[PDB]
């Protein structure tokens, strides 16, 4: 139950769940949520809130969809902004981003803290110091930005970033990263509308795999 139940995937790792997979955790108000734990990468104990792997799922979705979450436990998903807020409210959570290109290269980025605010603050990103990684830093430029979707423009651009670059993100004017963008399968001619991490493969290359995950700092 909530009194004794795990709050995150690090609690589950500590209790001897050593294989990655879906487990029930208890959010701060006791709401149970089934989450994907990555128990393998970089020490394990990561709660995964975004996964892309094959383009099977449409990510060009509205505020409501991003708010509640969408996709499949068996594949690609967005866990949901209300859930991500709840998961990152208590304590301090480090962010890890894992990327794989179509050539087989694995790259990563790590930040020392990560929080998304509530819906009243439009799921604003509060991001701590970049730690390092082969992917470089394409998220600090998004610190302190509201989340935006095609139907709800909260960016700091005169344009509608989510529509122009075909994703959903804490867009600024407009982005350095776009991991909820179109699944464009490597090199693309269109500018900056793919699963892009510009510090690594740039604005014209869309990754094969994206995983975003958190663990207590």
Question: Is 164 a residue that touches Ca ion (CB under 5 A)?
Answer: no
Cβ(106)–Cβ(95) below 8 Å: no
157 binds Ca ion per the rule CB under 5 A: yes
> Which is closer to Ca ion, CB of 76 or CB of 155?
155
Angstrom distance (rounded) from CA 212 to CA 59: 15
Shortest distance in whole angstroms from residue 192 CB to Ca ion: 15
Using CB under 5 A, which residues numbered 124 to 153 contact Ca ion? 153
The CA distance from 47 to 191, in Å, is 31
Shortest distance in whole angstroms from residue 25 CB to Ca ion: 35
Number of residues that bind Ca ion (CB under 5 A): 3
The annotation status of 153 as a binding-site residue, yes or no, is: yes
Measured in whole angstroms, the distance separating CA 202 from the mean position of its chain's CA atoms is 18
* Least gap, CB of 102 to Ca ion (angstroms): 32
Cα separation of 123 and 169, whole Å? 10
Q: Does 20 bind Ca ion (CB under 5 A)?
A: no
Closest CA to 36 of 52, 55, 60: 52
Nearest to 88 by CA among 44, 33, 43: 33
The response to whether 159 counts as a known ligand-binding position is: yes
Contact call for residues 161 and 173 (beta carbons, < 8 A):
yes
Q: Judged by CB, which is closer to Ca ion: 1, or 158?
A: 158
Out of 155, 179, 183, 200, point to the residue binding Ca ion (CB under 5 A).
155
List of residues contacting Ca ion (CB under 5 A): 153, 155, 157
């Amino acid at each position: 139950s909530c009194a004794t139940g795990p709050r995150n995937c690090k609690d589950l790792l500590d209790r001897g769940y050593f294989l990655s997979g879906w487990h029930t955790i208890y959010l701060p108000d006791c709401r149970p949520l089934t989450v994907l734990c990555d128990m393998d990468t970089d020490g394990g104990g990561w709660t995964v809130f975004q996964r892309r792997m094959d383009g099977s799922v449409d990510f060009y979705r509205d505020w409501a969809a991003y708010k509640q979450g969408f996709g499949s436990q068996l594949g690609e998903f967005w866990l949901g902004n209300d859930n991500i807020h709840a998961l990152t409210a208590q304590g301090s959570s480090e962010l890890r981003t894992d990327l794989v290109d179509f050539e087989g290269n694995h790259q990563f980025a790590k930040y020392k803290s990560f929080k998304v605010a509530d819906e009243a603050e439009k799921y604003k990103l509060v991001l701590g110091a970049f730690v390092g990684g082969s992917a470089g830093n394409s998220l600090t430029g998004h610190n302190n930005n509201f989340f935006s979707t095609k139907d709800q423009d909260n960016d700091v651009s005169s344009s509608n970033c989510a529509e122009k670059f075909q994703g959903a993100w804490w867009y600024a004017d407009c982005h350095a990263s776009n991991l909820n963008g179109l699944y464009l399968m490597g090199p693309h001619e269109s500018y900056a509308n793919g699963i892009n991490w510009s510090a690594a493969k740039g604005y014209k290359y869309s990754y094969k795999v994206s995983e975003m995950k958190v663990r207590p700092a």
